[PDB]
Amino acid sequence: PFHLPLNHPTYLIWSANTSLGKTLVSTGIAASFLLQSATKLLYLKPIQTGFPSDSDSRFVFSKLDSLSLRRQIPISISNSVLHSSLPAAKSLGLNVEVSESGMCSLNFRDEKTVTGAPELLCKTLYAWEAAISPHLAAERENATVEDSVVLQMIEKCLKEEMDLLCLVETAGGVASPGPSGTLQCDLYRPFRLPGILVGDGRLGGISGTIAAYESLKLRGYDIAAVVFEDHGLVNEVPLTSYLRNKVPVLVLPPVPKDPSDDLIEWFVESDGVFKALKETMVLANLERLERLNGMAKLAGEVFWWPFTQHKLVHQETVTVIDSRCGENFSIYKASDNSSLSQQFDACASWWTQGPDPTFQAELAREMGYTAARFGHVMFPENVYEPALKCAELLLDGVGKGWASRVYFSDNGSTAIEIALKMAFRKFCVDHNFIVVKVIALRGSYHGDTLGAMEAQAPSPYTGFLQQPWYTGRGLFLDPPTVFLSNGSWNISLPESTFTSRDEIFDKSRDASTLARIYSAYLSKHLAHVGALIIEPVIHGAGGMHMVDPLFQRVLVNECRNRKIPVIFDEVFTGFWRLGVETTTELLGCKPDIACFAKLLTGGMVPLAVTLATDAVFDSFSGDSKLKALLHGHSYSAHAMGCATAAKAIQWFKDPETNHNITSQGKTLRELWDEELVQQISSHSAVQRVVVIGTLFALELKKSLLIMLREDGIFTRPLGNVIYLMCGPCTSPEICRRLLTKLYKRLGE
Amino acid sequence: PFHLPLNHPTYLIWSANTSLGKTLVSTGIAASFLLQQSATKLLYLKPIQTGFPSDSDSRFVFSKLDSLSLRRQIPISISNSVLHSSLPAAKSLGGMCSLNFRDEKTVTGAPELLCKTLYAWEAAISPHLAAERENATVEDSVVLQMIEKCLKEEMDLLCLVETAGGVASPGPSGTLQCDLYRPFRLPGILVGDGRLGGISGTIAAYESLKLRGYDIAAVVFEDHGLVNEVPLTSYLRNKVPVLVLPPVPKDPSDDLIEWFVESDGVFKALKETMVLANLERLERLNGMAKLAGEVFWWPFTQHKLVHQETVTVIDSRCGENFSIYKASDNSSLSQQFDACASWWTQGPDPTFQAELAREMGYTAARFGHVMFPENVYEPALKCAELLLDGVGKGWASRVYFSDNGSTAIEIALKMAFRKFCVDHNFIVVKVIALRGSYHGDTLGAMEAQAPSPYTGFLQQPWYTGRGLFLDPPTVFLSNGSWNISLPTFTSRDEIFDKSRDASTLARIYSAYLSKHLQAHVGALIIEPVIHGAGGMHMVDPLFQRVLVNECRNRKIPVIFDEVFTGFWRLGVETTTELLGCKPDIACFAKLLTGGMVPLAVTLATDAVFDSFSGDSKLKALLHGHSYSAHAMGCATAAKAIQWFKDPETNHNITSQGKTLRELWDEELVQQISSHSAVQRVVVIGTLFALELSLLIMLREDGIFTRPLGNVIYLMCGPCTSPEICRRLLTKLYKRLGE
Ligand SMILES: *Cc1c(COP(=O)(O)O)cnc(C)c1O
Ligand SMILES: *Cc1c(COP(=O)(O)O)cnc(C)c1O
Numbered sequence A: 001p002f003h004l005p006l007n008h009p010t011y012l013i014w015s016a017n018t019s020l021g022k023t024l025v026s027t028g029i030a031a032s033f034l035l036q037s038a039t040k041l042l043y044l045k046p047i048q049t050g051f052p053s054d055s056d057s058r059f060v061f062s063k064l065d066s067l068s069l070r071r072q073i074p075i076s077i078s079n080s081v082l083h084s085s086l087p088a089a090k091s092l093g094l095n096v097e098v099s100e101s102g103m104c105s106l107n108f109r110d111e112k113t114v115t116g117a118p119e120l121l122c123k124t125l126y127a128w129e130a131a132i133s134p135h136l137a138a139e140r141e142n143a144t145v146e147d148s149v150v151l152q153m154i155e156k157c158l159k160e161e162m163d164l165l166c167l168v169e170t171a172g173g174v175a176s177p178g179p180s181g182t183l184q185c186d187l188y189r190p191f192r193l194p195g196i197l198v199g200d201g202r203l204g205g206i207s208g209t210i211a212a213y214e215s216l217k218l219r220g221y222d223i224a225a226v227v228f229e230d231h232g233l234v235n236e237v238p239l240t241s242y243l244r245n246k247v248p249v250l251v252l253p254p255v256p257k258d259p260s261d262d263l264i265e266w267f268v269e270s271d272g273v274f275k276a277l278k279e280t281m282v283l284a285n286l287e288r289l290e291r292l293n294g295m296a297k298l299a300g301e302v303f304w305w306p307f308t309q310h311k312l313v314h315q316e317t318v319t320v321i322d323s324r325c326g327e328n329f330s331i332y333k334a335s336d337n338s339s340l341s342q343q344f345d346a347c348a349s350w351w352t353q354g355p356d357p358t359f360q361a362e363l364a365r366e367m368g369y370t371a372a373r374f375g376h377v378m379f380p381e382n383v384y385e386p387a388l389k390c391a392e393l394l395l396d397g398v399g400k401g402w403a404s405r406v407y408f409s410d411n412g413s414t415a416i417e418i419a420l421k422m423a424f425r426k427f428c429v430d431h432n433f434i435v436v437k438v439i440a441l442r443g444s445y446h447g448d449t450l451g452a453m454e455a456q457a458p459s460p461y462t463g464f465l466q467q468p469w470y471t472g473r474g475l476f477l478d479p480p481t482v483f484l485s486n487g488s489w490n491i492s493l494p495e496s497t498f499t500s501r502d503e504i505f506d507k508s509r510d511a512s513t514l515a516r517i518y519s520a521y522l523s524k525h526l527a528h529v530g531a532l533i534i535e536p537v538i539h540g541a542g543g544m545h546m547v548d549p550l551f552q553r554v555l556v557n558e559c560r561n562r563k564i565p566v567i568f569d570e571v572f573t574g575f576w577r578l579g580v581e582t583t584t585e586l587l588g589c590k591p592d593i594a595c596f597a598k599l600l601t602g603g604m605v606p607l608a609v610t611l612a613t614d615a616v617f618d619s620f621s622g623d624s625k626l627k628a629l630l631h632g633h634s635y636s637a638h639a640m641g642c643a644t645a646a647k648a649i650q651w652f653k654d655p656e657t658n659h660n661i662t663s664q665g666k667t668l669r670e671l672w673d674e675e676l677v678q679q680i681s682s683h684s685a686v687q688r689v690v691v692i693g694t695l696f697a698l699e700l701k702k703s704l705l706i707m708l709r710e711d712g713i714f715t716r717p718l719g720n721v722i723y724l725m726c727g728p729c730t731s732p733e734i735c736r737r738l739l740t741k742l743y744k745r746l747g748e
Numbered sequence B: 001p002f003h004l005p006l007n008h009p010t011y012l013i014w015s016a017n018t019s020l021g022k023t024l025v026s027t028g029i030a031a032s033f034l035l036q037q038s039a040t041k042l043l044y045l046k047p048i049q050t051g052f053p054s055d056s057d058s059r060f061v062f063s064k065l066d067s068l069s070l071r072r073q074i075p076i077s078i079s080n081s082v083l084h085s086s087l088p089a090a091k092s093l094g095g096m097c098s099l100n101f102r103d104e105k106t107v108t109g110a111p112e113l114l115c116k117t118l119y120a121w122e123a124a125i126s127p128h129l130a131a132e133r134e135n136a137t138v139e140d141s142v143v144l145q146m147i148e149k150c151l152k153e154e155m156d157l158l159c160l161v162e163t164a165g166g167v168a169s170p171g172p173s174g175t176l177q178c179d180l181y182r183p184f185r186l187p188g189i190l191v192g193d194g195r196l197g198g199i200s201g202t203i204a205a206y207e208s209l210k211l212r213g214y215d216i217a218a219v220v221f222e223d224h225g226l227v228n229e230v231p232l233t234s235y236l237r238n239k240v241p242v243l244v245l246p247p248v249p250k251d252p253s254d255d256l257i258e259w260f261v262e263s264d265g266v267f268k269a270l271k272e273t274m275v276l277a278n279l280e281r282l283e284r285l286n287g288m289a290k291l292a293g294e295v296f297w298w299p300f301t302q303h304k305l306v307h308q309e310t311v312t313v314i315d316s317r318c319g320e321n322f323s324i325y326k327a328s329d330n331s332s333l334s335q336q337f338d339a340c341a342s343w344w345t346q347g348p349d350p351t352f353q354a355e356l357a358r359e360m361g362y363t364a365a366r367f368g369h370v371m372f373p374e375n376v377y378e379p380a381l382k383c384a385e386l387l388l389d390g391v392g393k394g395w396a397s398r399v400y401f402s403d404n405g406s407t408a409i410e411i412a413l414k415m416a417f418r419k420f421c422v423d424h425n426f427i428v429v430k431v432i433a434l435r436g437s438y439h440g441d442t443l444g445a446m447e448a449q450a451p452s453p454y455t456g457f458l459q460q461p462w463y464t465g466r467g468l469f470l471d472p473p474t475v476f477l478s479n480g481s482w483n484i485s486l487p488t489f490t491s492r493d494e495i496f497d498k499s500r501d502a503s504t505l506a507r508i509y510s511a512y513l514s515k516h517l518q519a520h521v522g523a524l525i526i527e528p529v530i531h532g533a534g535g536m537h538m539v540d541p542l543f544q545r546v547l548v549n550e551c552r553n554r555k556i557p558v559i560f561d562e563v564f565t566g567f568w569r570l571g572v573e574t575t576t577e578l579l580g581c582k583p584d585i586a587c588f589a590k591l592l593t594g595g596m597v598p599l600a601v602t603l604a605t606d607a608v609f610d611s612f613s614g615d616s617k618l619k620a621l622l623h624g625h626s627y628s629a630h631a632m633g634c635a636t637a638a639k640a641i642q643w644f645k646d647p648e649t650n651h652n653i654t655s656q657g658k659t660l661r662e663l664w665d666e667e668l669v670q671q672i673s674s675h676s677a678v679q680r681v682v683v684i685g686t687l688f689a690l691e692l693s694l695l696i697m698l699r700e701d702g703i704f705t706r707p708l709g710n711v712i713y714l715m716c717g718p719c720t721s722p723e724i725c726r727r728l729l730t731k732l733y734k735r736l737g738e
């Protein structure tokens, strides 16, 4: 729910290490900018230790008072400190009071106002006595501050004062722990502010500057310039070379070694460089805004969007996504004051999404490492770690006790297509062959490649308009569904209450009236049927229909008894989407072939996987290459996606890394506030609701999505079906905030 | 062509910065290892050394072990050699000088210490400056090569290779040290920073080694009472051990001999961690093939024919070369050229690969993956721009993202047919394509393929090839001249020359086509210039050019499938430049993304686009995978498109011409086509193919390649040095003589 503005440049001041000029750099910049109308410089120092002997914010205040007298250019100036620890406060003669977190709100302020003059505003948000890493100071002086509160506070300040330049001076190195222990570069990530890196002009500064630089990149920050103090080592050359001259490297003149030195003539001597640095920063912002302000119009002109009728998409609809931090997009809207705002990704970018901000950062690292170690290496007949590992994790988990082989493809569609080739051989070897057909459930869906399309029954997705070869190539049955209405779980079956959601999934029902009834209607219908293929539990693209699990269980046994290969398509259900790692756990039955993707890779990159039985495998063990399965894309098992998936499989499953993971460990905890779920099932305009795992869907008895968009919720519809989808790691607090927004809106 | 062994642990000693204990660390380790109560041997390499001879890390290790040896009272042979210095450095001892310099103190039978400084300079700054000041330089290869000699010369046993400076400090050549060592990908440990700011410094140094795909077995630093190890371990999720050495004596006069003893605990730990991590790495390698065969279902492979002995273990990749573990050749990693370009995806330099990695991490971190439809974000918008201004120059107006070639092709068909079934308002449709052409393994991409090893009933009942398939004239090099097969040329260029537009064959072609032209033909689809999966057949360009005009004249949509030809594979960015004609729809992948990750793209005409501009969503093209335009692939492709095209980043792009130069030895391509066993040869851009066990022989010459039955090819990246291709043809030619 953040909302920062871009009409005015706002920069982080980073530094490779300690004692490298960071605050001088801030001061030069502030100076070059102020000593030249209602021109205003806002200097934030959000974290400060060694207070009050050291106060970078005071220094900036001080040195500008001085530089102002030198240029003879009056200015208003102020230096405020908002919160300190108790010890820090005492150091200022202060019987101040401590909050539940150990901070004091100081009244401390230090204005020297000159009406109408260019204004300087310096602020230290949080201060500690001990001149040490904030993380230690916080525990020593029992004064802590949560990352959110820090960012939140910076946001208040930022908005309170929004020509204009804002500098936000970091504390310590790029990767130095903040008060909470969170490395500083991770703490600021949610805001993704551009910045400059104060480098190291000493011996070892090349290595130190490049590493610090690389570590900001690795977090997806942008660095407008690198600056350092000349120590006669000619450090800037290797720096520029490495930066391919794509980022300017400014070299400040040596600083006076005499501790008594004013620096006032050094600042003057360095005007050149500071002028440059300021322009580079001011510039880069304008250029960043120019591109943002043209991206929608250009998007509309150059893109061919999937599943979109362009005639209906207006530029004012086109969403500009500048970055993503876990569940939230950062979205540029110029119709504001040109501002970036968080907006929840509630379609999970087509059901691919899962990662924490935290996980996302970790994944990135793993990916860069994998890119660097393997990039992409030839799969067939070869082995390499990320792939071997991914396969092991897949078999010991989602394919536990049934799967023996893992076949890699690039996505769901390719996965499904391979499953068909697979199923049919198993069949046409079980019965030695004719003409084959799938059996599937109407409304089920399996990808948009022609083969994956054939196992789909006629739908908005099929026809003559999509594929003029689309026939509708199997035997399609209408499935009973299940859903939540006015506070109880119901059922809908072909013309031909449960006490709770679990009751439905229960084994109590294997001996019910309906198991027999189902068994009968199936056995009847069972132009040759070659394979069974289902979207276990949920019909996704179908409109988030929960299929009666018992129906599917029975159907699986029916085909299995008939020696028909069973294909589970868990591209959508797999890996925690529904609150379990496989739906194998919800149907009670196992398949012969299953397909995975979307969440397989934690929503970072596409990879897909098709698991097989020792038997389905064997049905291709011949003597000619011609009896092998000749399907395989160029990027088969690409190390990247493999390594990534390997990591997501583990992280999502582990109660340590994923805090939604429950005790038994086979299961997610409920994420969707029980109360609101009932509430929404009881709604006038709500026809039905389906809720399980990370999925909250409803059906209705362009408009409501509009309202949700204003509440910071991006989501995609399925015509009249409207859903909220989180990741395997989203906090129930967030889901609850999410249901609230949606409910209020329904009242419209 | 490198060949280093893993039966003995070999580690780089990295350090976050200068003055942090690096050489102490090396010394403790060496000590913990040699002062135990055999033919136990420690090889200490210091490949780069400045400040020589006042400073000699190699001498320090030599000295301190002499001392520690008397302290534990455990004799050892010891030696300290300096191989090359600069002239100034040499003079300081009464364009590199080679020195005799050696300093043995041999004790027969005792555990041996072997210290070596490979290259030394006298001044005390970054090697990169010392090299230009003392006019003594050394090329990265020569450095690595030298370390390899030493490594092999002396191959229980532990070898330490002590870096110079920071993780990211310039070597003599200017190459950051972490890049210089990449080709070897040796595991290592990172000596961290126990001082104020060491947390940030240690993490960034660490992340910069990871970003280069190195593995770090432990981090160690000297306690300065700041409790630095906690944030370190937290950050490392305790997955890497963080060893904390006790404070070092601040008195400059201190022996350190009692500190080293005091730190034995930590050094034993550190040595074990290192020794142990190698055994664990080897255990995994030594089981990977067997396990691969048990767990994998390999594409385009008959498992019954793949023996464990065949399974290749790939430990990493550095540009064009795999690092391959063979337990056979004395559990050793060896370079092996990726001459199938991992199914024609490959392109990147070692250099480019590193750059790409960074770009990808940044992209993963900035975007991971974000919803495409109706949205815009930079890597995607950028990629699209670069695509239209280049490969789709002056014809393409739309870019449609999919995940691979197959998905790309499938979308093209949906696209083509609507354009058609709106040009003629509709029936039943079928493609026209050339026999042997290929377009992916999804059923739709399969239909536009005529019967082949790839199609059938065994491969998919639903195949029927919904098309009209013509047998195409081909072209090829034989006994020193370009020929033709249809159902002699002066030079290869007389072939894509458009003066042949007015030849006898243009009208003959025009006629054979026009006949079959006017069961409805809905779209034209070709593999421009080359039939890839078909067996590397060069199709007569003129034939295709004509055929395009023929269909275009008939208002039939034209689909170029440049999934294989796109982006420099053939020495050009598109084949639009070789066919003279333009299409209505084109498909790209494989090299689109520099061979790093899969992405694919289908370009369209303003018109083909418009044929889907209705009022219902049901009218729109309802095709689109979950990862449509995934920021990663997009950002990556954007970068590869630029890098490959730019003479600055890609040195095969002629400075004057601005295009792939000629790569394959002209002399040797002739000798080959002129050879007995060699039936034909096709050679253009990055592709060298011939038609006719031999892959076995090539494997021994360090060349990994896939066949197409009897077709046998060598495929490099848009950036491979002709020197390498020449070395490549040589190997292949010699083998043919067998
Ligand atoms: C998304 C999906 C697919 C297809 O995966 P893509 O990567 O989108 O091709 C197949 N089946 C189901 C149930 C899906 O949800
Ligand atoms: C490789 C290839 C394809 C298919 O791409 P994948 O990513 O392998 O599915 C299509 N057409 C041609 C000519 C190709 O070479």
Ligand SMILES: C[C@H](N)C(=O)CCCCCC(=O)O
Residues within 6 Å of the ligand: A202, A203, A204, A205, A206, A207, A208, B018, B019, B049, B050, B051, B124, B125, B126, B127, B164, B165, B166, B168, B169, B170
């Ligand atoms: C002289 C001695 N070998 C030494 O510590 C050299 C430092 C190397 C340069 C590291 C840098 O500036 O990044």
Ligand SMILES: C[C@H](N)C(=O)CCCCCC(=O)O
Residues within 6 Å of the ligand: A632, A633, A634, B300, B343, B440, B441, B533, B706, B707, B708, B709
């Ligand atoms: C594999 C990928 N679809 C491709 O373009 C190549 C086609 C098949 C070649 C099979 C081989 O390597 O022998």
Ligand SMILES: C[C@H](N)C(=O)CCCCCC(=O)O
Residues within 6 Å of the ligand: A018, A049, A050, A130, A131, A132, A133, A134, A171, A172, A173, A175, A176, A177, B195, B196, B197, B198, B199, B200, B201
């Ligand atoms: C007191 C001074 N401001 C200071 O450098 C504190 C932070 C130290 C950096 C945290 C690290 O070790 O990485």
Ligand SMILES: C[C@H](N)C(=O)CCCCCC(=O)O
Residues within 6 Å of the ligand: A307, A350, A447, A448, A541, A716, A717, A718, B624, B625, B626
């Ligand atoms: C996008 C991916 N191929 C997938 O399976 C999702 C279903 C199709 C899109 C449904 C919609 O229009 O929102």
